[PDB]
């Protein structure tokens, strides 16, 4: 409603770096808000794509941002009569970024890994990896929970059980308020998908450079399965956290599996022990139900509500014809211990191939009326197909069915405006929460400031 679409702020990165593929607000030890931006195709030292991370200070004029530097050299360790190898070429550093306290977590889901023992090998596979930084102090740490030293022959004998070689950890990421990093790995367990959790403090204390294989004892990984419903389900494509079991001491996990049960798609809500509390099934096959998940209380009852995006949903139209437009599902948490029922509200896109629901960002309370609001991106929507971000306001009964404000892309065609979103943080300290929108196709980020209601 009250986002300013006239005076925007533009941050930009190198050409072809996919600057803006992932972003988040970052507060330093003094509460000064900045913007961390991931650019997963930034060039490295050997003139090869390795990804990169930028930390943009808040300026109304925007512009260029300094780099948040990480180690981009491939590592080799000859230990235990084995050879450990990391490969950072085309790893995609910055394909996901997230901030918690004064720490930034930027991940490279396609960092490869292999272990050589004589003529055998573990196989060169993308286990993924995440880099952790404390910018004010310069501290650095890494976390790669799917690195192993088991040789290829063993996986074949045991029928590829507990095969974390293709995790792509850091594909999606989130941090609990308590400080526990939760990584989504959609390729874990031979593309079933797994989650990796570990306290941020223990990641730093247990990391030393060059070890490559080290134990993080407080970590917790989800479990393999022999149920074909989970096969090729990409469990962990998207991740989020919230409070769903009525116990404020436990933190619950929300996991998106957009190809679950033969491309039906699913979203599951679990406790911190990965025990399943609820499961939301997709409405239509190949709609990628679970591509994006978001958790916020939209109806002002204090109970977190769940939003799920299916950007490839084909809407039914006249003459028995379907039209891919995308769809968003709203689930209101019931009072006390009860299962989430049918969706309270269905928001369906309008533009063909618009992918309405590719990203869903909680905005906090935008218009300051007591109800939290959201933003839904259609990165190829709008009458021109350049992209659109639509704001839906909270109400006592859920959300408004019609948008209060639509943000047309200020970028050219193909910018994927809205592919990444983040809100609910006041960056200019004016009392209203603001919105940052990524357009990696144009290597730029747009900042929309919220203003008093007109």
């Amino acid at each position, epitope marked *: 409603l009250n986002l300013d679409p006239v005076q925007l702020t533009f941050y930009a990165g190198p050409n072809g770096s996919q600057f803006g593929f992932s972003l988040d607000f970052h507060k330093d030890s003094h509460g000064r808000v900045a913007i961390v931006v991931g650019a997963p195709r930034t060039l490295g030292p050997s003139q090869e794509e390795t990804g990169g991370v930028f930390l943009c200070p808040w300026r109304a004029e925007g512009g260029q941002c300094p780099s948040l530097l990480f180690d981009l050299r491939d590592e080799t360790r000859n230990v235990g009569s084995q050879t450990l190898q990391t490969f950072k070429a085309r790893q995609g550093l910055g394909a996901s970024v997230v901030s918690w306290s004064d720490v930034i977590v930027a991940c490279a889901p396609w960092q490869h890994w292999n272990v050589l023992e004589k003529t055998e090998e573990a196989e060169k596979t993308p286990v993924g990896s995440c880099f952790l930084a404390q910018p004010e102090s310069g501290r650095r740490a890494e976390y790669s929970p799917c690195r192993g030293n088991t040789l290829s022959r063993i996986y074949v004998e045991n029928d590829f059980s507990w095969d974390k070689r293709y995790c792509e950890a850091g594909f999606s990421s989130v941090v609990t308020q308590a400080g526990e990093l939760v990584l989504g790995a959609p390729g874990g367990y031979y593309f079933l998908g797994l989650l990796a959790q570990a306290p941020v403090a223990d990641i730093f204390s247990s990391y030393r450079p060059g070890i490559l*294989l080290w*134990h993080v004892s407080s970590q917790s990984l989800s479990f393999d399965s022999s149920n074909p419903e989970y096969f090729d389900g990409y469990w962990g494509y998207s991740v989020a956290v919230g409070e769903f079991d009525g116990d404020l001491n436990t933190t619950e996990y929300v996991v998106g599996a957009p190809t679950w049960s033969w491309t039906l798609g699913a979203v599951e809500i679990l406790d911190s022990y990965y025990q399943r509390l609820h499961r939301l099934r997709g409405e239509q096959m190949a709609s990628y139900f679970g591509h994006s998940v978001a958790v916020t209380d939209v109806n002002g009852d204090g109970r977190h509500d769940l939003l799920v995006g299916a950007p490839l949903y084909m809407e039914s139209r006249a003459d028995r014809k379907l039209a891919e437009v995308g769809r968003v599902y709203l689930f209101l948490q019931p009072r006390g211990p009860h299962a989430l029922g049918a969706p309270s509200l269905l928001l369906t896109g309008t533009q063909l191939y618009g992918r309405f629901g590719s990203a869903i960002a909680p905005l906090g309370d935008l218009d300051r009326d007591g109800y939290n609001d959201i933003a839904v991106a259609a990165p190829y929507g709008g009458p021109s197909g350049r992209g659109q971000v639509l704001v839906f306001l909270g109400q006592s009964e859920g959300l408004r069915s019609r948008p209060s404000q639509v943000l047309d892309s200020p970028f050219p065609t193909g910018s994927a405006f809205g592919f990444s979103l983040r809100g609910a943080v006041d960056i200019d300290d004016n009392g209203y929460p603001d919105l940052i929108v990524g357009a990696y196709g144009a290597n730029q980020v747009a900042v929309y400031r919220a203003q008093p209601v007109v």
Partner: antibody
Amino acid sequence: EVQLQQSGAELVKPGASVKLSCTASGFNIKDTYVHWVKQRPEQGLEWIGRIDPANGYTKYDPKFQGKATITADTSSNTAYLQLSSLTSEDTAVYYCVRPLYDYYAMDYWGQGTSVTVSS
Amino acid sequence: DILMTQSPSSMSVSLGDTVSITCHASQGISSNIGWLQQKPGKSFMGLIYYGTNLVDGVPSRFSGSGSGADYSLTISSLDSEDFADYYCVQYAQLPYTFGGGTKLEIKR
């Protein structure tokens, strides 16, 4: 806290067999590698072998191939070292070891199980 | 197997001394070495792993260094508890092999 509580001292005859135990306290034995090390005053320290209790796979110094047999039961959270055809040269103190962070390190040690072979 | 030659076998030193134990390998091990302590009539405690990294709980006066096949353990300002046995161990290759040992003794 990480503590490795081994069995008590053994007193056996030559030609017999013995099975030492290493129980994990304050953690799951399945987390890391578990090693076995032999100590004698003259010969010093010698590395017997290791086991990954998650799967049971083992490695051995070829010097101990035959006498040493390392096993593990995740149920009782314990790792074992079996020695067979005992000799006067098998009279030693035996420790179980596990690493702290580095997968391949030798950081945490049990108190040691004394073994004496004599007729 | 990799031979580990630890020197010296013993040294007579006093409190507050800054001393150094060395450990030479038969081939390069690239900091894949640990350092151990065995107080008289007791078990082992880890001091260093991967050449330089302190084990959690070990005082900062201990410090490891070296590269290739020549490494060193250094104790700045000896404490009354530091008089004990010390061993090195390489884990660059299987089987793991240890050093001969070094005993710190009180000088008088």
